[PDB]
Amino acid sequence: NKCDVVVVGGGISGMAAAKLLHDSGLNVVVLEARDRVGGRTYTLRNQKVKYVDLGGSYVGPTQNRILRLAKELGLETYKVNEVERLIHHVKGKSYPFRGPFPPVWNPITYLDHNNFWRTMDDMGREIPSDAPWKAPLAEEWDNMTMKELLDKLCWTESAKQLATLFVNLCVTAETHEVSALWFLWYVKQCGGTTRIISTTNGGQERKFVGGSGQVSERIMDLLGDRVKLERPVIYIDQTRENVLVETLNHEMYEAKYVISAIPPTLGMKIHFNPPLPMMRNQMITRVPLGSVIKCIVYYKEPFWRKKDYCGTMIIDGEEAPVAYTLDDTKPEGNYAAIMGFILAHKARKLARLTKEERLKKLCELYAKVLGSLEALEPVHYEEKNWCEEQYSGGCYTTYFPPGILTQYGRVLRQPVDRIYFAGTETATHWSGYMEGAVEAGERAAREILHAMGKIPEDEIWQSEPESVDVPAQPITTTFLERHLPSVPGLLRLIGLTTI
Amino acid sequence: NKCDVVVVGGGISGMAAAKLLHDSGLNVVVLEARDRVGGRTYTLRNQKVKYVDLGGSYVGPTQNRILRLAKELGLETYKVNEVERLIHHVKGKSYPFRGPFPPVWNPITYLDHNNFWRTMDDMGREIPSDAPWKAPLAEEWDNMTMKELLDKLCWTESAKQLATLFVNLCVTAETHEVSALWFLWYVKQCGGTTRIISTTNGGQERKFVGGSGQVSERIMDLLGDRVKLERPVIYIDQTRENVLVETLNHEMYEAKYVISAIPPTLGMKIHFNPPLPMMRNQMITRVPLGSVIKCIVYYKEPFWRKKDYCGTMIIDGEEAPVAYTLDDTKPEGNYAAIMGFILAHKARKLARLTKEERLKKLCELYAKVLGSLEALEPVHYEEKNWCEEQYSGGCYTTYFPPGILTQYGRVLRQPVDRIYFAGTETATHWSGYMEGAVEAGERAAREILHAMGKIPEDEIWQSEPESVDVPAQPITTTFLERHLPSVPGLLRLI
Numbered sequence: 001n002k003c004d005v006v007v008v009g010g011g012i013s014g015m016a017a018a019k020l021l022h023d024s025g026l027n028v029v030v031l032e033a034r035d036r037v038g039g040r041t042y043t044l045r046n047q048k049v050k051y052v053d054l055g056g057s058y059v060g061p062t063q064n065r066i067l068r069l070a071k072e073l074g075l076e077t078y079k080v081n082e083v084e085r086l087i088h089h090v091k092g093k094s095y096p097f098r099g100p101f102p103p104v105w106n107p108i109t110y111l112d113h114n115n116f117w118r119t120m121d122d123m124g125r126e127i128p129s130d131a132p133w134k135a136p137l138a139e140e141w142d143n144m145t146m147k148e149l150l151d152k153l154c155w156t157e158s159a160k161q162l163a164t165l166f167v168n169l170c171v172t173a174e175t176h177e178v179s180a181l182w183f184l185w186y187v188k189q190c191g192g193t194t195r196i197i198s199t200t201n202g203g204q205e206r207k208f209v210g211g212s213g214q215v216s217e218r219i220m221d222l223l224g225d226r227v228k229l230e231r232p233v234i235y236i237d238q239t240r241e242n243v244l245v246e247t248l249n250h251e252m253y254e255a256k257y258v259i260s261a262i263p264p265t266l267g268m269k270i271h272f273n274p275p276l277p278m279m280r281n282q283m284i285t286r287v288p289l290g291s292v293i294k295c296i297v298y299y300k301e302p303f304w305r306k307k308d309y310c311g312t313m314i315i316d317g318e319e320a321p322v323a324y325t326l327d328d329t330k331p332e333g334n335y336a337a338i339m340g341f342i343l344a345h346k347a348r349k350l351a352r353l354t355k356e357e358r359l360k361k362l363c364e365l366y367a368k369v370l371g372s373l374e375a376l377e378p379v380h381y382e383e384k385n386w387c388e389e390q391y392s393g394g395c396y397t398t399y400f401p402p403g404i405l406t407q408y409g410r411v412l413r414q415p416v417d418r419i420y421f422a423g424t425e426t427a428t429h430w431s432g433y434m435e436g437a438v439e440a441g442e443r444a445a446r447e448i449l450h451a452m453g454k455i456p457e458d459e460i461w462q463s464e465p466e467s468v469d470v471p472a473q474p475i476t477t478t479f480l481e482r483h484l485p486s487v488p489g490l491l492r493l494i495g496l497t498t499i
Numbered sequence: 500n501k502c503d504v505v506v507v508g509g510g511i512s513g514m515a516a517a518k519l520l521h522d523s524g525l526n527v528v529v530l531e532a533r534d535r536v537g538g539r540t541y542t543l544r545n546q547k548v549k550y551v552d553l554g555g556s557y558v559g560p561t562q563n564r565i566l567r568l569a570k571e572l573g574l575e576t577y578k579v580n581e582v583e584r585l586i587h588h589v590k591g592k593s594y595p596f597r598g599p600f601p602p603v604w605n606p607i608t609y610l611d612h613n614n615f616w617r618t619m620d621d622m623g624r625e626i627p628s629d630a631p632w633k634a635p636l637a638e639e640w641d642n643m644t645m646k647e648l649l650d651k652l653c654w655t656e657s658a659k660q661l662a663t664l665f666v667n668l669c670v671t672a673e674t675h676e677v678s679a680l681w682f683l684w685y686v687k688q689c690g691g692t693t694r695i696i697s698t699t700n701g702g703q704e705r706k707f708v709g710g711s712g713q714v715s716e717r718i719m720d721l722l723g724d725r726v727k728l729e730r731p732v733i734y735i736d737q738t739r740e741n742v743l744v745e746t747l748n749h750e751m752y753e754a755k756y757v758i759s760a761i762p763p764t765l766g767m768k769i770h771f772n773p774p775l776p777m778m779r780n781q782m783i784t785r786v787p788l789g790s791v792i793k794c795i796v797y798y799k800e801p802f803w804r805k806k807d808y809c810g811t812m813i814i815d816g817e818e819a820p821v822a823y824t825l826d827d828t829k830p831e832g833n834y835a836a837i838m839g840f841i842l843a844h845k846a847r848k849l850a851r852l853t854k855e856e857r858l859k860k861l862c863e864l865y866a867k868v869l870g871s872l873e874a875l876e877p878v879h880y881e882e883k884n885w886c887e888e889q890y891s892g893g894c895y896t897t898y899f900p901p902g903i904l905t906q907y908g909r910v911l912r913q914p915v916d917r918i919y920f921a922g923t924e925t926a927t928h929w930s931g932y933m934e935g936a937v938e939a940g941e942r943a944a945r946e947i948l949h950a951m952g953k954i955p956e957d958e959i960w961q962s963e964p965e966s967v968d969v970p971a972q973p974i975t976t977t978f979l980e981r982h983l984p985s986v987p988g989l990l991r992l993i
């Protein structure tokens with residue numbers, strides 16, 4: 001019943017917040033809706049797979065908070081396989097390559113591709129990580145979808161097609177669904193295009209040995225009976241001296257402060273007394289999560305490696321159910337597997353099928369892309385459609401439709417009396433990721449410590465030392481990448497000389 | 500505890516559903532979150548105003564269901580004042596006019612304006628009212644915002660400015676916030692551009708004597724203790740023989756079927772067992788309501804009439820807090836008043852001010868537009884910001900951002916086991932309006948009657964006889980309106 005802080009939600013963000021507060025000597029309770037902790041992370045264990053992440057999985061350089069937390073809990077990472085060649089499959093043919101981006105040989109198409117990535121980062125530099133609505137052209141960019149921006153920016157279909165896949169893969173949403181301002185912010189706050197798309201030296205470099213679910217599980221172990229499972233919060237009352245938090249199973253909790261560590265829109269599942277301020281009231285109806293099915297197909301051996309393919313496939317085209325894959329084989333070389341994402345409208349479309357029907361479609365796609373009949377002989381299959389989850393709303397994260405970020409963005413992490421806001425959506429570095437979950441949970445916890453007079457104001461936001469185990473190489477560009485003209489730039493140069 | 504049907508929500512839609520079921524002999528209970536019925540309608544009574552609609556108010560020709568229901572409950576209508584001239588205020592000057600559309604004199608601008616309205620209706624003819632996602636170009640139009648469409652269609656700033664006002668006023672949202680497919684559907688399902696924008700012979704022709712709140716209030720009177728106030732629904736369990744509905748104040752209700760008569764997104768406030776199907780689970784996070792403050796300024800006399808102005812003002816420009824007004828004077832000629840809407844981003848922006856600060860800004864605007872110092876001497880003021888309402892989410896209605904209607908639209912009124920869906924958002928004629936609320940509530944009720952084997956399938960959807968009191972004149976066009984070229988059409992001809 002009585003405690004110092006109630007944390008609503010036992011995902012990584014809520015668990016990180018609770019741990020910090022507990023370590024500081026406060027009495028905390030975590031109220032979790034599900035019969036498990038972890039939220040958008042979920043590690044399944046059985047004999048066929050040993051373990052598999054069906055939710056969040058990848059970590060990499062510059063994600064120092066999640067790496068530090070996991071290390072303290074006794075966890076280790078291993079490198080995702082990128083020894084052999086990557087594949088770009090376009091117009092029904094596969095093209096192997098090395099390096100983070102598929103090579104482009106046509107001079108005009110090359111200029112267009114180069115200008116696309118460059119411009120994404122150029123625009124990003126004008127967007128403050130902690131206040132995207134303060135960008136000089138915030139309103140102009142927010143009033144445009146990513147589809148509109150790509151239509152303007154890409155002078156070739158080749159570039160527009162890859163750019164579209166990039167958006168779909170980053171934020172599990174269609175280009176016409178999302179604000180240009182918000183998407184440009186999203187990429188910039190991860191460190192830019194190269195960092196976000198890279199396996200080696202990027203966001204997909206590593207996974208945790210034994211699964212990411214261990215982060216939330218091991219924190220639960222530390223907290224003991226303080227974590228309450230199957231306690232969905234239904235009601236928060238701030239009209240009295242202590243905050244009252246009610247659960248669906250009829251329990252009452254009393255606290256000095258509350259941390260909301262759930263996806264912003266899931267705040268709708270709670271009835272508030274007094275009512276929320278107008279801006280938050282409407283904000284939480286304007287912020288959907290994306291759509292994705294994560295699918296893992298198991299094989300006897302990692303047969304792709306024999307053909308000098310690492311297992312990474314970038315697959316363009318409406319017909320392909322999966323647009324992106326990575327090798328999901330265990331570090332020991334066993335439980336050979338390919339992980340693939342079914343993205344955005346395809347998650348909606350293909351959800352109609354049976355599990356067996358999806359497995360068949362994936363194997364037939366992989367056989368084509370890898371040019372290997374071996375892909376037609378799976379030994380096992382696991383999948384999770386995150387669109388069906390009442391207490392997630394989708395995956396990976398929340399997207400902002402046109403017009404919303406400028407109008408409502410500033411209230412995302414603004415306290416409401418004694419309620420403070422965590423969750424990855426409120427992070428300023430790797431928001432949308434496990435990293436952002438840690439940043440946000442610890443920041444919200446320190447906001448409360450400051451409110452209690454236990455720490456100074458300058459200690460609310462804290463820097464993180466770089467991991468010694470996962471060093472970060474800097475993002476570099478070549479002279480030609482920096483200075484080569486865009487397509488319209490070249491046309492202007494021609495028009496000028498021919499005058 | 501035990502009944503035949505639980506109706507969640509006591510707005511016009513829930514009340515209409517409950518009345519139909521009650522009249523058929525079934526035991527109904529209405530669970531309403533607030534301490535009042537009416538929802539997005541709310542009639543305030545006090546000595547200064549007598550009565551005033553702070554929510555939904557206007558009814559007109561072709562809205563036969565709301566007119567019939569109100570008449571049965573003993574209500575009457577009166578005509579909104581449109582005797583004298585309307586005003587279009589643009590670039591700081593007022594231009595009085597007659598007829599539904601402000602006149603345009605520049606020849607190129609005339610062609611652009613004419614083409615805009617015509618094209619809106621042209622596109623609408625290809626959109627089925629009961630299935631907008633079946634339009635031949637559904638995906639193309641759904642993947643575009645109204646801003647993108649207006650940028651393509653309007654060759655003059657004059658037309659684009661008026662078109663933008665039109666969108667803001669219709670759906671209390673910015674042009675860049677909404678799907679083109681959804682907006683074109685919205686206009687078409689009200690009967691087209693002329694019908695939706697007109698006072699005389701259109702959606703704003705009339706108001707109810709005594710206020711629209713009386714519709715929900717008088718149905719509550721009929722139902723007696725069957726309406727439960729301050730019972731927000733928190734939990735619906737369909738895992739057992741009878742459906743279980745739990746409220747925030749700890750009560751349990753047991754029923755054969757449930758009608759959800761709340762805005763689609765407000766379904767998020769209910770925890771479901773078993774969980775909702777995937778498509779509905781995500782749909783209810785993708786469908787926000789618009790933003791509006793409704794403001795009524797009172798004066799000693801309807802002084803604008805002396806200058807041959809009816810009180811209608813169409814006001815363009817960022818600086819103006821209010822883009823549209825109507826005369827809100829009582830039919831008896833007393834309680835003189837001007838009703839105005841603060842729309843979309845302006846509702847967000849000006850909410851920061853005090854009530855007194857908004858009153859001053861409105862009076863100064865009205866003095867400018869009406870060219871009358873009398874506008875600076877208000878006797879009273881009432882306002883309501885619908886953005887603050889936990890159990891509405893906004894007003895007037897739900898809008899669809901780009902991409903949503905095609906992907907999720909088909910599940911809007913699809914039953915989930917024993918839950919059926921009412922609410923104006925599920926209507927096929929005047930969805931967004933009180934009329935749509937009645938259509939949807941009665942249809943959802945008849946879906947349950949059919950499920951119980953009490954009526955045949957062909958009786959679920961029922962036509963409505965035309966009101967004898969509010970006859971509808973047909974929408975007409977002239978030869979020149981039909982056949983004059985667009986701006987690019989004229990350029991092609993040259």
Ligand SMILES: Cc1cc2nc3c(=O)[nH]c(=O)nc-3n(C[C@H](O)[C@H](O)[C@H](O)COP(=O)(O)OP(=O)(O)OC[C@H]3O[C@@H](n4cnc5c(N)ncnc54)[C@H](O)[C@@H]3O)c2cc1C
Pocket residue numbers: 008009010011012013014031032033034037038039040041054055056057058059231232233234261262263266269270292294386391392394395396397422423424425432433434435437
């Ligand atoms: C398929 C998939 C792929 C992705 N891959 C990666 C990846 O590779 N790398 C990466 O870093 N991130 C990835 N992500 C995203 C990552 O998982 C999230 O960013 C992160 O887990 C979010 O943590 P959170 O604590 O902020 O929120 P959540 O994990 O959503 O936690 C919120 C918790 O609150 C609970 N809750 C909800 N409502 C209530 C209520 N009313 N009362 C009580 N409790 C409630 C929920 O049950 C949940 O446990 C992926 C996610 C998925 C699903």
Ligand SMILES: Cc1cc2nc3c(=O)[nH]c(=O)nc-3n(C[C@H](O)[C@H](O)[C@H](O)COP(=O)(O)OP(=O)(O)OC[C@H]3O[C@@H](n4cnc5c(N)ncnc54)[C@H](O)[C@@H]3O)c2cc1C
Pocket residue numbers: 507508509510511512513530531532533536537538539540553554555556557558730731732733760761762765768769791792793885890891893894895896921922923924931932933934936
């Ligand atoms: C300022 C304004 C101007 C508009 N003007 C007009 C106009 O001129 N003409 C016109 O026709 N229409 C107008 N509209 C729109 C019109 O009011 C609506 O279309 C109509 O009232 C909707 O009725 P409804 O029953 O479908 O939904 P609602 O009126 O929203 O009713 C839903 C009810 O459900 C309740 N509820 C919500 N959640 C729960 C819960 N969890 N448990 C139990 N109950 C719950 C709510 O409290 C509410 O009473 C306007 C509205 C406003 C606010």
Ligand SMILES: C[C@H](/N=C/c1ccc(OCc2cccc(F)c2)cc1)C(N)=O
Pocket residue numbers: 058100101102162163165166169170196197198203204314396432433
């Ligand atoms: C699962 C999620 N990953 C996001 C992600 C985002 C972008 C990615 O880009 C891959 C890529 C490579 C080459 C070209 C291209 F367009 C995209 C790959 C993954 C995460 N790590 O949380």
Ligand SMILES: C[C@H](/N=C/c1ccc(OCc2cccc(F)c2)cc1)C(N)=O
Pocket residue numbers: 557599600601661662664665668669695696697702703813895931932
């Ligand atoms: C309040 C809401 N009314 C919607 C409405 C919609 C459109 C309207 O258009 C007025 C108008 C007139 C002339 C030109 C123009 F662009 C708009 C007026 C009102 C309703 N009746 O529910």
